Each structure stands twice: as C-alpha cells, then as structure tokens.
Amino acid sequence: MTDRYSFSLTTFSPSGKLGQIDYALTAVKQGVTSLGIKATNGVVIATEKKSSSPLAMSETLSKVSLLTPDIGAVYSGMGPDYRVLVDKSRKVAHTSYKRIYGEYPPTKLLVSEVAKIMQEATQSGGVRPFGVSLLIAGHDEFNGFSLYQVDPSGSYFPWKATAIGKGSVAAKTFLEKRWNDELELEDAIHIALLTLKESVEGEFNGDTIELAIIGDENPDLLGYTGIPTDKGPRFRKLTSQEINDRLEAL
Amino acid sequence: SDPSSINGGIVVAMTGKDCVAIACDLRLGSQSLGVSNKFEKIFHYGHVFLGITGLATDVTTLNEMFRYKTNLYKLKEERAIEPETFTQLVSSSLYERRFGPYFVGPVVAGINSKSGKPFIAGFDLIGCIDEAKDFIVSGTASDQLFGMCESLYEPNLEPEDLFETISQALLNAADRDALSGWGAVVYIIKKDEVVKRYLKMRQD
Amino acid sequence: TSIMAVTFKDGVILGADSRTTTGAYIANRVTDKLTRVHDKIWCCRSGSAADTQAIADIVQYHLELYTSQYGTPSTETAASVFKELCYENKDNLTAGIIVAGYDDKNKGEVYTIPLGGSVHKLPYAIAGSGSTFIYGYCDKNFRENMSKEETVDFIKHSLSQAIKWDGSSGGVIRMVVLTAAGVERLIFYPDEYEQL
Amino acid sequence: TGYDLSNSVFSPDGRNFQVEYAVKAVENGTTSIGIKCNDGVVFAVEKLITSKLLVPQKNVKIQVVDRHIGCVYSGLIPDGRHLVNRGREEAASFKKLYKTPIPIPAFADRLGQYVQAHTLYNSVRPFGVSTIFGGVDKNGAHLYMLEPSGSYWGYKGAATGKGRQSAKAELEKLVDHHPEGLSAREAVKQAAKIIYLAHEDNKEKDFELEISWCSLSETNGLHKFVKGDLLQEAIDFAQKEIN
Amino acid sequence: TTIAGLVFQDGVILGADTRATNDSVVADKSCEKIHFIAPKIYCCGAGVAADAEAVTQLIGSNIELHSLYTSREPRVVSALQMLKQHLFKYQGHIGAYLIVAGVDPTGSHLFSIHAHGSTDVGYYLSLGSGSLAAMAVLESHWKQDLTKEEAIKLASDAIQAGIWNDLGSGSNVDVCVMEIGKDAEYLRNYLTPNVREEKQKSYKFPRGTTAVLKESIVNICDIQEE
Amino acid sequence: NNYDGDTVTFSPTGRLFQVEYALEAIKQGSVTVGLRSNTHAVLVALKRNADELSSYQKKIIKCDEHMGLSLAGLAPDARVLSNYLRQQCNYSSLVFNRKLAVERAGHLLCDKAQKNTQSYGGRPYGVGLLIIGYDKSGAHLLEFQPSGNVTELYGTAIGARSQGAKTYLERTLDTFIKIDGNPDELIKAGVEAISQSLRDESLTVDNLSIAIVGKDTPFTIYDGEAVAKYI
Amino acid sequence: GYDRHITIFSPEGRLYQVEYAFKATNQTNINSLAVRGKDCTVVISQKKVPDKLLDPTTVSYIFCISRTIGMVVNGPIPDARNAALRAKAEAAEFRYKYGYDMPCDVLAKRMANLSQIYTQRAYMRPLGVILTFVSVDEELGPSIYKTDPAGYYVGYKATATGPKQQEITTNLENHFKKSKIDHINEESWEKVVEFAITHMIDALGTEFSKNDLEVGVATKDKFFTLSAENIEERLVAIAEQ
Amino acid sequence: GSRRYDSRTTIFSPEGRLYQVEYALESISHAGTAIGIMASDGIVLAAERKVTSTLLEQDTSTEKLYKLNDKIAVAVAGLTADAEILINTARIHAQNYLKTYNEDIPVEILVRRLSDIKQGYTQHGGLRPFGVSFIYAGYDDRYGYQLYTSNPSGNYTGWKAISVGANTSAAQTLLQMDYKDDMKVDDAIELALKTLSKTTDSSALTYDRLEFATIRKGANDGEVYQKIFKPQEIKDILVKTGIT
C-alpha cells in the first residue's frame, strides 16, 4: 500500500529525446482538431464535438471551458487529462493570484501556472505527462487580447492564430492565408468556421461544433447590478442557434 | 508594553486635484528616550508610496517584504504594480498573520498610471482596508491628525496648496504628541513628478 | 432551554421550547431545538448552540454513511455516536443532548447524554436550564404506556411550567411525534399553554 | 509476456495473473467447508496429521472474530491469520463506534475491501487463502466465502481447498434434499461426513476433524467449538457413512 | 454596526450602515458591510471588520470554484455551511457575525451566523451593536407577504433606528435586494441622512506659511536612460 | 526461476520461492532437538564451530523464567525473534501480571514472520526455532518455520540430518511422554535422539548444549562440564 | 515492453493498461441498460446465479449510493465494491460540507477524476469497471451518467453496457429515432421498467424469468431496487399484451 | 515491486560519466544557438529562436532571454519549461539576498546557487536532470561585467565570449578568431550577429527569428540598464550591421 514510484518515468534517451513527451504529442495528434484565432477586438476558440454515441448528450461534455471571467480554454488529445487541468487551472487562479491581489490573473500568468503543472508531470516521480495540448484565449487590462498554446512538455507560445490535433498542418496553412492584423471578431469567427469545416467529416452545425469568444464585457451575464467597475465576463460560449445563424452566411 | 506606542511616529496622506500627498515625522524612540531623528516611515515601490507607523522593527520588516514582493511582481507581470492592487497585497499580507500580527498602521498613496486617478488607503494591523476619498491618518497622534484633517481639509486642492494643508496637519498634530516630531517629510506626488520636502519643526 | 423526550405506547415524542439567549437578550425567540439526525431518530439540544449543531451535523453525516452501507441504524447506535463525540471531546464541549427514536422492533426509545459524555437509557428524559423546575412535576405525573393525547398533554403541561419559571426558556413549545405512522410536527403558542 | 511477474498488472485478457497464482496456493491447501442451517452456521476443516508427534486437538485452525463470527480458511495459514487479525480490528472499531456487534454482511465487506486492496499495488502480494466465514446477527444466519481477488458471495453451503469438488457435490445434494432447511445438530453431522468424504483427495496421510458452530438455539448466537460427546457423535456418523 | 435582513413576498433583503470604528473614533465614514459571495448571495458583516471581510472573501472564492466544478448556481446553504464550519473551527477567534441571504434554485433564504459557529433561520434578523434598535423596529412593523416597496422601507427603517440611537452605528444606509427570477440589485448609499454641513471658514493657508529646510526631486521611474 | 527475485511474487504453481530459500538456510544449520513429557520440556542442540581455534556457536536463548528456544539457521534472525519474544513475555508480566502462554507466543511469532512474506523490500526470516515452555496448561513444545507456520508437538528436530532424530522420537513417543518428575531421563532421551542425526562427529563437552524447563524448574541452559554427565 | 505493464504512453500514444481494464469490464458476461421516464430513471441488469450453493439475494451489481443516487456496475465485483464504497463516502462527505445532496452528475465527475488519477499515477492500477450512475436530480431531472477506466464520463438519454451493448444500443437508438424525444413518455415508473425489460428482450433475443433480472428505479427523493416478486408482476404485464 | 521500472537517473557509467547529463547535453545541442559576448563597457546576449512560423506572435513571445533581476539576465538553450522552473527559483534567491543584506546579489553567488540545484538532480532523488544550459549576463560592483554558463551537470565557468546550444563548436571557433579584449559593446553586437548568421541552420538570419539583449553601464549617470530588444529594434540592428 505504498507509492514506490519516486523516480522519473520520463527520461532522456541516447539521442536527447524525452520519449514520454514525444509520445504525449503523438496522442495530441490523434485528438480532434481545435483552433484559435486572435482578432483586434477579440479572440475565438473552436473545436468539433466528436460525439462517442448518438444516445450521449454532447451538451453535457464541455470541450470549451471558462477558466476565469476573461480567460477560456480548449484542447486536443485526452479529454480526462484536460478536465483535471481545468479544475487545477481554475483553482490556481484563486490560490496563487486572486486571494493575494484581489483580481484575476492576466492570461500569460495563468498560462504560466498551467505550463508549470504540465512541466512537473514531465519531471516528478511516478507520473506520465499530460496527453493534451491546450489553447488558452484571454483578455486583461494591460496586455489586451492574447492566445497561447500549451504543450505536454510545459512549453507555451503566443499565437496570432493556430490549430492543434488531427488536421492541424492543413488548418495552420489555411489560417496563414486568411489572417491579417485588421480582423474584427466577426471576421475571425467566420474564418474559424471555414477552417474547422475542412477537418470535420460528418454533420456540421451548432450541435456538433463548440465555439467560444473572448470579446466585449457582458454586463447582462454578470447576475447583479450596483458596482460600476465590475462590467461582466469577456468570455462567452456561443449558443447552438448563434452558430447556425453564421453558417447561413458562410 | 503596547507595541504600537513604544517607538512612536505618524503618517498622514491626502488627495488633491490630480495629485496625492503623503507625509510622516522622523522620530524613533524607546518610549521617553529619543534615539533617531532620521527614521523615515515612507517608502516607495515604483510609483506606489507606502507609509508605515507602529513598531519600528515591523516597519523595517514590512518595507523589506513589500520591496521583495513588488520586485517579483514586476518581473512576472512586466509592469510596475498599481496602488489599488498593492492595497490588496498589503491587506493579504497583514491578514495572513491574523493571530500573530505585525504591529503597524500602513498607509498607501499613489496615482494609477493608466486612469490617472488619485488613490489613498489605510489599514489596521490585520489588514482591514479603509479606502478614503479625502484623507488617511495613522500613528500615535492619529486622534490629533483626525482633528486637523477633518477641519483643515477641503477637496480638489492644487499640489502647492495641498502641501501647506498636509504639512500644517502633521506639524500641529505632532506638537501635541510626546512620541512624535523631531523632524518631518512631505511627498507631493503627481502623475510623472514627485517632490520631497523636509519641514522645519520644533525639536522637542 | 427546556427540552424533554417521552416514550409512550405507539412510540416517542420530543418536546422543546424555542428561546435562545445571549445573557438576558433573547437572540432568537423561534429556535428549532428538535433536530433530525435520521428519518426516525431525532435529538433535543442544550448547552452551546455552536457545539450541539456541530455535533448533530457530524452525527447526521455518520448515520447517513451508516445507512448507505448497513441499512437503518438503531436509536442505540445513534446515541452511541453522539456519546463518542461528547465523551472524547469533553474538555472542549458544552453539550447536553437527548436522543429519541422509533424502531419497529424496539418501538420508542430515549437516551440522555449529559455534560460528561455518559449515556443513560430512560423511559423519559428532561434537560436544559428550565428542567430543574419540573423534576417534581414530571416524576409525579409520568406513567408508562400513555396514549398519544396524554403524552402531548404531559409534555405541554411540563414545558409550560419550565417556561413559566425559567427566564432562559420561552416562546413556542415545539414537539415532534415519532411512530410507525411517520413523523408529525406540532406547535403550541403562548396563549394556549400559559393559561394551563 | 511478463504480465504475471507483478501484482496489479492487467494482462491483455483483463486478468491479474498474480491473483490467479494465489488461487493455486488455496487449491493446494487442506479442505475446509461451511454449512448454513435453520438458525445458524457450521464450519468444519480437514487437519492433515503430518506426523504422530503432532499433539491432538491443539493446533486449532478455526478462529473466532468478536464473539459471534467464525472463520475458517484453506491455503497459506499465516495469510489467513493476518486476515482474521484485521477482521478483529474491524469488528472492534465497528462495535466501539456503533455499539452493536458487527453484522455479518458488514463484516464480509470489511474483509472483502482489505483483500481487494492487496490486488491494487505491486508492492504487496495477494492473499493465499480462501476464507469461509459467517455467524448469527439481528437478521439471522449468514455464510460467506471470500477469494484472493476480494470476491465474496453469500452461500447456502461453501467449500474450498484440495477436496472442494467432492465437498461441493455433497453440499449440492443437501440443498436439493432439504429445501425447508437443515437443523444445527444435523449440519454438524453432515459437516463431519463431508470432510470425511472430501478426504479421499488427501488420502495418503490420516487427518483430524475440527468443527465449530454458531446457532441461535444451540449456542445463543455465539461461536463455539464442537467438543467431546457431540464431536464424537459426528465422527461416528461420518465413519458409518463412508463404510 | 447595524446590519439587518428580512424576507418579503418573492425575495430577501439585506441592510447595513456604513460606519467603521476604532474604540470611540470613526475610522471609516463610508464602508461596505454587505459583502459579495455569489451573484445572488450576499453577506452582512459585523464584529471584527478584517475577520468579517476575510471570511466572506474566502468562502466566496470557494463558492465560485464549487460552482464551476458542479456547473450549478451556488446555494445559500452551501455558503452557510462553509462559513459556520470555518468559524466553528476557530472557536470565536475570528470575531465575525454575519447575516447571509440569497436566491438560488431552492428559493430565497435568510440566515444569521455567529463567531463560534452557531446559525439561525429567520424571517427577520439583526446583528451588531445596533441590533436592538433595529429589532425593535422589525418587531413593531414586520408582517407576512410584504411587497418589495414595503420591505425596502422596513429594512432601511431598521438600519436607521441603529444609526440614530446607536453610537457604534452611523453615516449612510446600504441595501441589497435579492428577488426570485431577477438579478440581485445592490444599492450602496441608498440613504444619505448624514451629509456634513458646510464649514464656517476655509482653512486654506497662504503659500509659504510652512517653513521648509530642504527640497529634492524623487526618482520614481525605472532607469533614466542614455 | 523468474518468480524468486523477491518475497512479494507467487510462482505459477502458487509457491513463494524466497520463503522456500529461507527454509533452505535452516536445513544447512546445525541439528537441534526438542521433546517433552507432562512435567518437563527439553531442548538439546548440537553447536557448530568454525574451526578448532574457534568457539562453538550458541544455539539456545532464554526468553523468560518459564520459556526459551533453540535456533537453526541465521543466528542474527534468531536474536531478533528471541528479543521480540522477550518483550512480549515481559509485556504480559508488566501489564497483566501474567506469564505468557506458550501457544500465544507461537501465534505472535507466526504473525511477525508473516508480515515479512507479504510486503516488498523485506525478506523472510532465515531461521527455524524450537520453543519450549511450562505455563498454566503444563509443558509445551513448538516448532517455528519462517514461512509463519508454528506447530505444537510432543517432540521434533530441525537442521541438517534432523530426519534421523525425528524418526527416533516418532518410535519413542509412548516412552518419553511418560517421563514425569525425572529431568535426567528426559534429557537422556533427547541426547539419544540427537545422536541419530550425527555422522563422523560425536557429542563432546563443548559441542553439546542442553536446556530444560518444567514444573518446579526455571528455564536453565547447561553448557561445558555441566553436560559431561550426559555424554 | 514495460509500457504495457504500467500507465505510461506507448509509442502510438496509447495506455495499454487502460485498454486492458476495459476488457476486464466484460469478464462477468452481464448486460446492463438504463433509460429515463418523465418522473423516473430505470436501470436493469442481467442476473446470473450459476452455482446452486450461492445465496441469490446477495448476488447483485446494483448499489444504493445515497437516497437519491443508484449505481450499476459492469465488471468484477471486488472493483465494483471498491467503487461503491468510495462513491458512498464521497456522497456523504459532499452533503456534510456543502449542505445539499450530491447530484448524480457531480458524483460521476468525481469518480471519473479519481479514475483519471489511476491512468496518470503509476502505483495505482485502473479499476476494471464501468459505473452507470442514475437519479432524478432536483435541478436536471431524470439523469444517467456513466464512468469508465479511462476517466471519461458523459450524460446519456439512455445507455447500455456489457458484451452485447452494441445490440442494445442500436435497439434503443432506433426507438428514439421514431419517438423523437429524449425519454420514455410514460407517467408511472412501472411502465418504464416494462419498456426497459421489453427492449432488452428484443435486443438480446432471450426470454427472462423473475430470477434472471435485477432492477433499480430512481424517483424524486429516493432510489430503490425491485424484489423478485415486483419483477414478476412486471413480467406478467409484458406477457399479457 | 517498483524497482523493475527505475531508469536510475543518477548513476555513473563504467567510464565515469553521468548517462542522463550526457544525454541532456545531446538534447541541448539541438536547441537554438545562444551567444554571450562580454565587452569593457557592456555585455551582449544574442539568441536564435527555433520555431519559425509566420503566425507566431513575436512581440509578446519569450523563449530565450529572461530577466532575473535589474542587473542579471539569462539566455536559455534546451527545454523552455525546465528553464522557467529554474528561472523562478533564481528570481527568488536574488530577492532573498536583497532582503537579507540590503544589497543586490553578486552575479557568481546567484550562478553558484542555480548550478548547485542542477547538481543535486544528478547526485540524488532519482529524477531526470534539467535539460537546460544557461548563459548568465550580469553586473555587480566587485567584478563588473561577467558572463557565465551552466549546464545540466551543475558545472559553471566564466567567459569573455561563449555559445550554447546548436553548432557551438563552429560558433566558438568564430568568436575565438574575432574577439579582442579592448572590444566595445557596438563591436560585440556585430560579432554576435555575424556568428549566428554563419552558424545558423536556416537559409537566412531575420528579425522574427532572434531574441537580443544588452546590459550596459551606459545609462544616465553611471547606472546599469538591461535592454531586451523589441522586434523592430532587432530589425534595425540587422540593417545597421549589414546582414539584411
């Protein structure tokens, strides 16, 4: 009834490769395509709701998760690993930041904390790396809008736009042609839906696509009135109807 | 025996039109014995100013602690901390010693670099925030300072008027307290210039 | 506080006043001191309100977990869990609890747990500051195997006197009836019981 | 391959080979049985007399837990003792907190969870015993049998060890021929017969019969060993049936 | 401090004064004693101000994480249970006295919590040094099925009773209204019955009145660069 | 073969090879005999020397005034187990004012040995013990194996060539059990039993070690010229 | 090839121990089914008592976790009971800490997170079980949530688990394609149980006696299992129309 | 038990080498080249980014050059995530020293501390070493301008000019050829960029590929300024030196 795995399960091979990180990246490659695009007045993150059965209620499975009111996340790879990272990411935003400074962390620092958790699974005793790549989109007052990718190694890079998982190579080429520094949020959503259609085989609608934005402040979603400084969450998950409306103008 | 009144001293902060002022006396004592006439109680971390009254070992300790924390903040955030955020950091840090507190009366003063808004705040020894529009007082002559500030203060004073008001609030309060005085310093803070003035006062 | 539990033919009845005081100020005049740890196992609380609430919440947790594994616990089992908490933490608790419950096998049972953390199984029990004034009355008037209506009158008359003499007791008389039929709540107002 | 070298490793089948290897140690051991009767349970065991130097009636195999539960096991005897020691701690803490003596189904799961825990890690070995146990609680008589995997079920009759197939066949007849039930004194006699019949598998060495029982009428719901005249009456009944 | 809470037809309402004191001196003339926990759960605080503030912020933080985890609106009983278990743990050393109220899927709720960890259920409650002044008003005027307009009036009256008659309580009245099926409305400075009157004189000094020994410019910037 | 690297691994036929290898260390150890009557219990041990300059390794250890054992195998493991017995005997006396039952002492040794066979990192004990004692139910002899198996016996032997002594005792069973109130005759039967396990070497004065416990006899060890009487 | 013995990645990005735990799931050779009514959630499971010496009343793979939550397990019983005891403990602790009954979906998530830990941490093996949680949740209504050895979980309109899950799944899929609703439009739970049994009979192609089935029913504020005589009444009604 | 799966990260080979350290160094040899050059009036840090994509947001990106305090910076070669763990430790050691002594930490003391942490992972704990090599560029009032390097073994050494990462053999030959002791910062900037331009595996050296920094005692009134170059500023210095 002992944990005797106090030694690294990820080690350097003779060629200098960290095998378990490479294999975790292979697991991410098999995962469903997700993407992120940064506009001037917002960020969009999107993915396919690959339903394991038609009897399953795919609404209950959230691939796109709120981390803070102004930060959202999506993934490609192993869903369970993602779910626990979201739980830890939400908590670390409070313990290592909000309870100290009285405000939510900026995107880059929350990303840094998630990255740290993933790095530790790559060096600590008796654990495998996380088998996910995250795309984290967010906004804060002093950095503005931003989009980050986080890999199983713990490495993170800021992107203007990117894709991860199944059809990422084709999708990244598609985004390179379409992206410019003068995109509005609606233009980015339109490009996101076009890019995502290429990697999807079957049905393509609001029920089989999950899409969220980091945009304007939503005081209607706040739940209370009477504090001028709290203007509401910038994160908003688009509804099944809101996606279908934009698919008619596609 | 009462730690907050062994060493003595005072801090007062005031808001004006597009400016804040923070001021302190220079005395450090061992009860009746005056020891130092150069013990400044106002520190700064970038453009945020922190005055601290109370037990002098904790004044020094907390300065060193907030220098530490604001330096790391700056390296990670890639920007200087703002007064509103620093206020929350002071509160957090004091309350984490809830049942073995630092015997201090901190006062934050500064101008938010983005909004340009003047900001002052005061705390008790366990971190309860008092965010005031007008003024904050602290120290062994806090009652005297409350009396001076409450009558002398008026809103929207220009920097060079505010200097006169805060200086006269400090000087006259200090002269009615045995454990305050021995010199004084006044900082006048604007969005991108800060003037520091040493006041002539009675040395008893 | 005035509290009592009384066994009778069909089962058991718990009774209590509704006054909570901070010194001479009545902090709450409509307190519910009859509290549910299981479907048909209840308790009356006296002493520190913080302590008795903390205990009762832990007991409810233990009996809920007992029921998931081993089925419905006996009233004796509930009294034992109360005792274990009270006895082992006697230095840090001020709790005087009466435990009352209905089995179909055992019928009505009453257990009293005073300050020390001892257990005593009794036909009826009284406790709280106001109980001192009704030891004489309750001893003279209690009979075994009373009807429901007789037991309600016995409790109503008893707590009426406890309330009359004790300043710490007052408000409404709450009661909870535990039988095979189920769980019945009763309430009796000052204008009813004061004129008895 | 290599899936059988470490405990808690799933083979490609979905099997834990180390647990299946522990079963082989159980199958190698002496025969033990349990019989559920009208108001109680009877336990019996085969004790191989390795030598004349063994003191008769001294090397007692059946163990009591609390005052109302009997335990018997086949396989590695020390592993069985370790499990009963745990069972006694579980029964003690249950009684300490809840006052009432531990119910048999409740007790069964305590052993079950503990044995199952020894299939979760490579740092421990599975138990090399199948344990037959039971007794009388507030809801009546209960007989259980617990395997190295942690698996257990309730039984009308139970048998384990080298002579289990022989015993199981005999128990199945009793179930068919007595649907209304078996009395406690009948079950003692039948238990003796079944151990004697099951001894054909261990026929090289002679043996010593040991029986115990819990019964609501015959023992007041407490575990007791069958001794003296009642033991000899059962041995005589068993000796008559084989001839 | 005068804090109060009461229920009305399809909601619950909280009230509080705005004075913070140190012994006999007024530390803060405008402070918020109605703390935030969830969008539709609020907490009136009395006793030690730092403690009441810290405990609500902590439970509010944990309530937010719980809400995210379970994908549900937080319940008032969860805040209640978390607050009382924390306060009980510290044996009254966290000197916070709280009135918790809110709306959730179960309905509208009103509770009080004491520093040692005891809780009460009520249709109208009050805490702090002005509780007796407030409770006198609530006992005289509270009835069943109050309208929102009557409830705000009664709550603000209960707080006012404390403001005038209790030295501990003063300045302004804050209110928070939590109604079923609606956004909670937080009404800071709902009443302002204690504005300071205009002063007789202006004490603004002639410039150069104060004697100065030295002057200097403070370098607040990073690196003056070449 | 592949399943003997540690104690935590069963073989495919349900065997624990590390336990069986510990059992083998006992067979390499020097012979010791145990036997009893209704009044007394006797240990007889053939001690082994390294060479002619060396002393003869002690085989018998006292646990209490009414109990003790002889060892065969790793002597440091016997020291650990005997020390554990001493403590359990001592605990029984201090707390309950009660001499520890010999049957209960066996149960404690069994359980101590068992823990080392089920957990990783540890090894089985590499020693066999013969425990004799006189308690409230008379004379007792136990045989401890480091598998955990403890067995109450009239007589036995363990160590190299122990099968010769064990067969003799199996024949003599009806005679030596009746040797009541006569310690010298019971020792004689033990010395005659251990002689059946000798080859080439014979029982000399610093070779032989005898111990006895009984009705009005504390556990006492005889070495040197004290055992010359029985040669 | 030690990447197949512990929970670390193979070169393909696979966890073989997780995949082999899924195979252990079908070791019992028992098929389960869960469906939702208007006011209820019904779960049925095959009951096989091969030995005549077994006490059939003690042979069960349905567990009462809390008053509101029921759980059926597909897999070996020791792992099933490991999972059951933990879920009971978690449900009780939840109620104590947060002051309301643990929802079915939250428990499912909690057990799934525990399952995820066994796929990431080497010293713990996965449990070889699939856990199907059922309740009538006070917020979400009739609920079915299922957890597996990977740590995956999701809500269901209906579901099936076991060796012949695909046959049962397609049978249920075809019914809901006709009705075009997420549930069995039926008032009484008795008729929802009759539906569940009928559609298992059709899917598996086998008839059932009272002792061949095991039934669990979730209603508002309680989950309970049916006796053999309650099931017999159900089987009589099916045969009579 | 668990022993079966233990790689044994902290053992000697028969030749007296630490396997995992050697293999970590092999990992580092594939990372983007970083160069440090120390002059009389300042230090230059130049480094080549590895993942050329047009969609990478370069102005908010930091994979190579990190700030430890106001006086000390590092250039990274290896696993970025590993480096960030060590960087945050080094940032804390500097502030601990400042809190204790009320003086900025001397460069060598900070370097030794980090190097000691790396060493620990090679001698105890059974964990893999950090796959990181640092170039430390710093200033203090004892030794003035200092360059150091540390590697996964925990060994550190001081340099006038040095490279880490890819093509260090080629890079060190070129620096050894053109470096002189009386050199100045502007000359060192040019040397650093010319060296990367020749050793790079890419077709051409551009601004979007580089991270660049200087530490100068050429701030206003004898203070020390750390300059992390913005993308546009790297583009300007590339045109100035005549590479693009």
Ligand SMILES: *[C@@H](CS(C)(=O)=O)[C@H](Cc1ccc(CN)cc1)NC(=O)[C@H](CO)NC(=O)[C@H](CC(C)C)NC(=O)[C@H](Cc1ccccc1)N=[N+]=[N-]
């Ligand atoms: C009224 C409570 S009362 C008189 O009925 O007990 C207010 C409630 C309140 C004020 C402010 C806030 C702000 N979020 C929330 C609730 N409480 C007070 O006025 C308390 C009374 O003790 N005041 C304080 O705690 C003050 C606050 C000022 C410093 C801003 N603190 C002190 O007086 C400290 C604290 C102290 C704390 C615990 C025990 C003893 C002393 N004393 N000093 N120094």
Ligand SMILES: [Cl-]
């Ligand atoms: Cl969890």
Ligand SMILES: [Mg+2]
């Ligand atoms: Mg003075």
Ligand SMILES: [Mg+2]
């Ligand atoms: Mg003086």
Ligand SMILES: [Mg+2]
């Ligand atoms: Mg009264």
Ligand SMILES: [Mg+2]
């Ligand atoms: Mg594992």
